Amino acid sequence: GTSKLKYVLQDARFFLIKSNNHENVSLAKAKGVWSTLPVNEKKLNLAFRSARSVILIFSVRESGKFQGFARLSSESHHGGSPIHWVLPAGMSAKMLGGVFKIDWICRRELPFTKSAHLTNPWNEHKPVKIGRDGQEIELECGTQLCLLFPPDESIDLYQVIHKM
């Protein structure tokens, strides 16, 4: 069913996360963590304190798809388990901000062809697939986008509901 999902998404905030490679999304799916540049780290930390749920919707650049979505379970923190991210050409890990813990809500993919009717008012009403890493997605657009994904029957939202 979709009812617990709708409950988790009620009055949520949504952010588009654009990854350069599948390796980083795979690591995030396995370890339940994400790290971003400090400009986005600050926005996500503000969002986490501000809303019942902050949802990250992931897309690997040039893949033509979203790869899933997850809910922040913490603000960013430093000094944890080091994460062997594949960093872009020239980037160092010291350039990253802290690490966010995340709980995956859906690890299934959604092709952009299926989200073409969804526009994001906070990015000039462009199709929601269009946006820089960290672009906030307006509530209605983000809710409908998350509801388009195939259900992930491996995930039980009971545990996530208890963290809200």
From Swiss-Prot:
Interacts with SRSF1. Interacts with SRSF2. Interacts with SRSF3. Interacts with SRSF7. Interacts with SRSF10. Interacts with CPSF6. Interacts with KHDRBS1/SAM68. Interacts with TRA2B. Interacts with KHDRBS3. Interacts with EMD. Interacts with RBMX. Interacts with ZCCHC8. It is found in: Nucleus; Nucleus speckle. Changing residue 104 to D: Does not affect ability to influence alternative splice site selection. Changing residue 19 to A: Does not affect ability to influence alternative splice site selection. Tyrosine phosphorylated. Changing residue 59 to A: Does not affect ability to influence alternative splice site selection. Residues 12-149 form the YTH domain. Changing residue 34 to D: Abolishes RNA-binding and ability to influence alternative splice site selection. RNA binds at residues 18-20, 34-35, 85, 133. This is YTH domain-containing protein 1. The YTH domain mediates RNA-binding. Changing residue 133 to K: Does not affect ability to influence alternative splice site selection. The modification Phosphoserine is found at residues 81, 92.
